[PDB]
A = this chain, B = another copy of it.
Amino acid sequence: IGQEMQMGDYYVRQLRGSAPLINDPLLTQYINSLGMRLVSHANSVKTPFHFFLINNDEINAFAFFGGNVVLHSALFRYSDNESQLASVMAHEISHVTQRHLARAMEDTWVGALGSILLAMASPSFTQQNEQEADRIGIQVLQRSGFDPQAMPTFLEKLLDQARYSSRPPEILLTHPLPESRLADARNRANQMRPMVVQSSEDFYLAKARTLGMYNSGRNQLTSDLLDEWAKGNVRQQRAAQYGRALQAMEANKYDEARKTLQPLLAAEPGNAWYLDLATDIDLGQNKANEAINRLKNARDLRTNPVLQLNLANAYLQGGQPQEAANILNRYTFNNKDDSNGWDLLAQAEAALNNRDQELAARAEGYALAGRLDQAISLLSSASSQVKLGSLQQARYDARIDQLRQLQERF
């Protein structure tokens, strides 16, 4: 487990630099708050878990060392309910806890494998591992309070689209599904108790933002899906109203987006989804003060990362880079693996013409993207602009030392 936490970091750093990862706070927070909810109900967990979202309209999901589960945004277009989406995550979670890929290789090497995981994200197991991944998957899926029949329903809807479409989805290549696999999935969900679970409000909002803001190819949020959601339950109707407000924002129709979002923010002034969108609309119309005052009146400002990055950007476009830096210095210290915070920090330090601090912030973004040589180059320039023996020299040079360890390792 010692090495595979480390090879996980090397592989996800490569994923950041090459694959089109969705770095959105609201979506990343959702996929990881949901995914961690199942890990807490999973057995034999050796590692922390992180869940990544790729902008890819091809449906696929996979996982590797260090509890890193990779999910394509296409999973939101296929998932009718939240339990189906978590059904695939528990499928992936069980692949890690059982260490399936670990043993496939215990029976030159790491770069040949890394090209495989990377090519899958950018636009296979034998069925003995896949039966077991279903085995443990639904127990976890049911002790997580989800619908156990969501897996046979979701597996079956992959099969219905593999005959009624030319070539099958890519998920069925890494996770093949014969009729035996379905019949087992269909039986064991039959064997446990019926559950009536409503999909969380965050699932429908996350689907809308995924298909609305990160549209690409078959990943569209179409009028047919929004009109259908206008008839659905109370949670789907707010998400369709949010989806219309989102797309009115995307199309630069800011005043309509404000009036469309108004009934949802008036009903829930402290919801982070509506606060995020209301900041985009205000910033789109050069009213940063309104976007600043609204987020300072948010209850969860100092506890919610989405609100912290949102108000930092609002401070940035509002001409107060120092206020942005105060948030972003604390944000990057508590969320050191978040590339959004380091980037906004680099923008803030650049606005203050703190050149060494700007280069130091840029370096973290490059290190997160697997560009360690270039991160070292920026920190070397930073170190060369400050007196030797200064605290900034020692800091920049020590950071260079730590990144050289990661490069000497591979």
Contact = CB atoms under 8 A, between A and B. Distances in A.
B260 A326 contact: no
B329 A253 contact: yes
Nearest to A391: B259
A388 B346 contact: yes
A290 interface: no
Instruction: Give this chain's copy count.
Output: 3
A304 interface: no
Interface stretch (A7-15, A169-177, A376-384): A376-384
A251 B381 contact: no
A329 B395 CA distance: 29
B381 A384 contact: yes
Nearest to A383: B374
Interface in A359-403: 359, 362, 365, 371, 373-374, 376-378, 380-381, 383-384, 387-388, 391, 395, 397, 400
A144 B326 CA distance: 41
A359 to B, nearest CB: 6
B391 A374 contact: no
Contacts of A260: 391
A333 B252 contact: yes
Contacts of A380: 374, 377-378
Given A251-B325, A254-B333, A326-B250, A388 B374 contact: no
Most buried by B among A252, A253, A260: A252
A223 to B, nearest CB: 11
A201 interface: no
Contact of A377 (B330, B346, B365, B377): B377
Contacts of A333: 252, 254
A388 B365 contact: yes
Nearest to A235: B252
B376 A251 contact: no
Interface string A337-372: 000000100110000000000010010010000010
B252 A330 contact: yes
Contacts of A365: 388
Contacts of A255: 395
B252 A395 contact: no
A112 interface: no
A256 interface: yes
A105 interface: no
A256 B356 CA distance: 14
A383 B359 CA distance: 11
A196 interface: no
Contact of A252 (B256, B326, B374, B400): B326
A234 interface: yes
A343 B388 contact: yes
17 contacts: A250-B326, A251-B322, A251-B325, A251-B326, A252-B326, A253-B329, A259-B391, A343-B388, A362-B384, A371-B397, A373-B376, A374-B383, A374-B397, A374-B400, A378-B384, A381-B381, A381-B384
